[PDB]
Design a protein around this ligand. Sequence first.
Ligand code: HEM
Ligand code: HEM
Ligand SMILES: Cc1cc(N)nc(C#CCN2CCC(F)(F)CC2)c1
Ligand SMILES: Cc1cc(N)nc(C#CCN2CCC(F)(F)CC2)c1
Ligand SMILES: C[C@H](O)[C@H](O)[C@H]1CNc2nc(N)[nH]c(=O)c2N1
Ligand SMILES: C[C@H](O)[C@H](O)[C@H]1CNc2nc(N)[nH]c(=O)c2N1
Ligand SMILES: [Cl-]
Ligand SMILES: [Cl-]
Ligand SMILES: [Gd]
Ligand SMILES: [Gd]
Ligand SMILES: [Gd]
Ligand SMILES: [Zn+2]
Lengths: 401, 401
Amino acid sequence: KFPRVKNWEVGSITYDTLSAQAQQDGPCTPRRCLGSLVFPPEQLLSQARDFINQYYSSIKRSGSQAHEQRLQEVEAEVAATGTYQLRESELVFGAKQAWRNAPRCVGRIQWGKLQVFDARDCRSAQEMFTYICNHIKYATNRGNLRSAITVFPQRCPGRGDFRIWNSQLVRYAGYRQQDGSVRGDPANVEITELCIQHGWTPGNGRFDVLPLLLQAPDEPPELFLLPPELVLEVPLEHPTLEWFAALGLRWYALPAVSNMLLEIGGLEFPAAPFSGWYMSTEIGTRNLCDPHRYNILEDVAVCMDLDTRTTSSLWKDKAAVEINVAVLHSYQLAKVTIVDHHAATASFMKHLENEQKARGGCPADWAWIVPPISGSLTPVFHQEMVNYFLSPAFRYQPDPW
Amino acid sequence: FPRVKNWEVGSITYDTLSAQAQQDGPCTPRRCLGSLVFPAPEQLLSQARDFINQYYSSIKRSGSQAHEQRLQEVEAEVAATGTYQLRESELVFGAKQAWRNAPRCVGRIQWGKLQVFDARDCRSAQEMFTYICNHIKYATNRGNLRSAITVFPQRCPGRGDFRIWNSQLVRYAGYRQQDGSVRGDPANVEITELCIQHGWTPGNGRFDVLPLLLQAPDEPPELFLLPPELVLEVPLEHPTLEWFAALGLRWYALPAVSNMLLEIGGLEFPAAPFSGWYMSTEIGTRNLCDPHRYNILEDVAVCMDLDTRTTSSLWKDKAAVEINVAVLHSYQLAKVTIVDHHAATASFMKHLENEQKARGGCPADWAWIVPPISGSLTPVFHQEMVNYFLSPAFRYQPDPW
Ligand code: HEM
Ligand code: HEM
Ligand SMILES: Cc1cc(N)nc(C#CCN2CCC(F)(F)CC2)c1
Ligand SMILES: Cc1cc(N)nc(C#CCN2CCC(F)(F)CC2)c1
Ligand SMILES: C[C@H](O)[C@H](O)[C@H]1CNc2nc(N)[nH]c(=O)c2N1
Ligand SMILES: C[C@H](O)[C@H](O)[C@H]1CNc2nc(N)[nH]c(=O)c2N1
Ligand SMILES: [Cl-]
Ligand SMILES: [Cl-]
Ligand SMILES: [Gd]
Ligand SMILES: [Gd]
Ligand SMILES: [Gd]
Ligand SMILES: [Zn+2]
């Protein structure tokens, strides 16, 4: 009843007993597996008890003193008001646990080192902006990146919602032409349309940093320019391919996801941006080489004089590896924290064993943990994984339009 | 009906074929287990009934004279004998469907082009051998490979199974060592021990072709050596790295899986080896670079004068891409059929479009379809997929020892 999980490199066997706790049912049934699809009143008290019980067991405080105590005040809080506020340490503990429970994150070896900014006493887009701006500057830290989450006020009935309209805090523009096709980042084309709609002058460049669209509850959004000296970017150069710099490619330093919904103990924070540091394949393989992204792969291969006339020359494979080398080299020369997919996967194997000892398993999404280049050269490829839903969690949510 | 998106293009289809999935898989709504490698007359009647229905749809004679005659016939044969016999046309269709239905085969654009050898009159292990040599000969075809399957007698009450103990018709010995290491292919240490135990005189090379261990019903397995001139091989060299030839590396031309059970209309064929042609990543990435297989990756990287002390130089990625280049160039030099992962995955995308129009979907195992290097450079990475079990089917079965 406890899934047997094998590692095929070594032959070791473990049993995922942690799977027994899954709440939000996944997309799969005995009839068919759907694991590769991207996006597959007093219920508030059940999840509240469960979260509080977690907290105290994690501080060796189950069934003692403040445990009994803290259960009542939230019971009383919901009774009177129909919701509750999290003790500061609980918000801290739930944010770290959500990151710990993110099956698609390969960087969770870091889950215990998280800096939580409490922005629950917020109102207005101007208030959001300086909170975001403090996050960005703290997390960037002149390139010595530091994990951070800013938690904006939770959700209540009657009132609108705090939402960041960008999927990340730093994204590049996407402009069309006299021919439908796109200049800049095609992923963001749509929010670039909303920004220009709300009175922003589009640039020319392929690497203009989009302005933020910040939304106070029940009020339409407000365009903000970010302070440019606050957006740390890295010009991309290759260590031995002198022409690579001339391609004018750049990527920003901070990956800061600003569209997911943090859920702790039963409360839903639709605005709660978290940031870490990049794994190089995210930039060098997905952002730059995806056919529906910057799609640069063939331009680099021409420059390398590779034979693009037959796929069996593996020119795609060759150009992709170099693009990744240029990302790692550029970030390291610019002294910005970055991790290669080999270092990151091996740390995740370390994470998995830690979690086997601590919690009896770890939810992991195999399709997202395995890197998008060189899959079977990393140890996660040969590791079987179990995927399920634990709380607290980061959840997807509809676009606020 | 599961909605399936292609993320490179934007397409959206619904998998209605999944609604007919018979046997159950390993996942539940609680937990996905997709990444795991190895997850009564009346029921025989209902399987057979469904297959016969299938066969008559494919000949555009559904609900006809011959259709009900065969249904009636099969029930009379199950009642009289507890089993029934496939006609030859039904056997050919059922083996082609088993390939069509195989979720972990990326080669299924070719499913209709399959050579079916009916060995169901096979009498002994010695005749079994003769049938297998002819299969290898036909399929190899001097390097112009042809897809084939030989079907040996079905499992039946009163008599044991025919079995090929070898997992493939062509496999290289793996010998344990003085210092606990393995010479040759470590995947094959167990079967090698069995051959020696069964009277084989081992060699001591790294690429020694294993003899066949062939089990006639209620017989111990019998040893048969493959005539050297039946096993086409390919010395491996690199188009520019001339020291590569000095590694002494080879691979065989024919991939012939011999340990799977073919299932048609409820009947079971525990011995029915099938074979196609390689995709270069199986040899280059998995067979040669897996740490638990030949594991040449670091040795290749040293020779390339890559810096193997830091993972961020991407030495592993660079040495693996050249190993694949060498595999492709070597098989093309020798005029032995081979497909690279870019051509293979593009033809699999055409298979999914053919299959959507034909059946309303296609069972696909994302983690097996996506190649082990350069995944997001192939279009199957960006394709969501539905995994499920259709009959007729190839199934895994326990090792006969
Ligand atoms: C500090 C170093 C970190 C690294 C190297 C890292 C790495 C990654 C990578 C490569 C992905 C794949 C996402 C994609 O391909 O779209 C991912 C996903 C994710 N990570 Fe991490 N991450 C880090 C920090 C964090 C932090 C601090 C949080 C939250 C507190 C977090 C939460 C998540 C979530 C929720 C996802 C799922 C994203 C999605 O579904 O789009 N990560 N991570
Ligand atoms: C004609 C060219 C073919 C190509 C290029 C091809 C390709 C592949 C590849 C790359 C795999 C994954 C195996 C692995 O990663 O270890 C696979 C699996 C498989 N293929 Fe195909 N194949 C071909 C022909 C065939 C034929 C003729 C059959 C059956 C009649 C077949 C049935 C299967 C099955 C059952 C599996 C799953 C094997 C397993 O789970 O171990 N294939 N194929
Ligand atoms: C914290 C963190 C660290 C890291 N290394 N990567 C990520 C990411 C991502 C990709 N992001 C793109 C925008 C989005 F689709 F909205 C969410 C997914 C996040
Ligand atoms: C017909 C065919 C074509 C192709 N290109 N690859 C294969 C394969 C395989 C994988 N093989 C690994 C060893 C085994 F477990 F014994 C059987 C499965 C088969
Ligand atoms: C459909 C498929 O699951 C999809 O392309 C996934 C595969 N794995 C991924 N893995 C990561 N880390 N990020 C992604 O966007 C994807 N895309
Ligand atoms: C544990 C993991 O599922 C295992 O390594 C799988 C992954 N995908 C694979 N895919 C193919 N095509 N062949 C394999 O042998 C494997 N191995
Ligand atoms: Cl990104
Ligand atoms: Cl093989
Ligand atoms: Gd030039
Ligand atoms: Gd040379
Ligand atoms: Gd050597
Ligand atoms: Zn599943």
